[PDB]
Design a protein around this ligand. Structure first.
Ligand SMILES: O=C(Nc1cccc(C[C@H](C(=O)O)[C@H]2CCNC2)c1)Nc1cccc(C[C@H](C(=O)O)[C@H]2CCNC2)c1
Ligand SMILES: [Mg+2]
Ligand SMILES: [Mg+2]
Lengths: 84, 84
């Protein structure tokens, strides 16, 4: 599993962070209150707790289930790019 | 005590909400995490837990100490305006 571009188009089910924390569901406000929901970002693919990039960070990310860690980049790398 | 204009200029010590809740200190991330701190909004007068309006809401406001109520308008009204 990997993302293309900056990962705005990523639509897989990867849901864990670079430090092995569990992503929080986008629809949930717990533990972290936020405004990155599917209503606010309808083009973001914000479903379940899957890594996404609705607001054009540099790569896919999520809020985390650790109350002390608001959000992290997900443990995904960019897919091999087209080479000449 | 009262505010002028939309209350961006309010610099008094009123610190309670329209429902009688206590304002959270601007520098604190508890109970509510936020980005309305004096470093982000240096022109906002964000000190202690006093009602302010750093981001041009319609009137002064604060985050609250009730974990279930993120922010409210403060219990302040507009000062009597200049009449012709
Ligand atoms: O938040 C933002 N703009 C905002 C606009 C209108 C209302 C509000 C809501 C304000 C509150 O409840 O704090 C109210 C209070 C009264 N006045 C407005 C916030 N923008 C924002 C910009 C950059 C970064 C972030 C943090 C964001 C996050 O950590 O959630 C990250 C996550 C990964 N990508 C970004 C947020
Ligand atoms: Mg790479
Ligand atoms: Mg009035």
């Amino acid at each position: 599993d990997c993302y293309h571009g900056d990962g705005q188009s990523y639509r897989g089910s990867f849901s864990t962070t670079v430090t092995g924390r569990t992503c929080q569901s986008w629809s949930s406000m717990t533990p972290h209150w936020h405004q990155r929901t599917t209503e606010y970002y309808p083009n973001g693919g914000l479903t379940r707790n899957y890594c996404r990039n609705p607001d054009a960070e540099i790569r896919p990310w999520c809020y985390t289930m650790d109350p002390s860690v608001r959000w992290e980049y997900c443990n995904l790398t960019q897919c091999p790019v087209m080479e000449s």
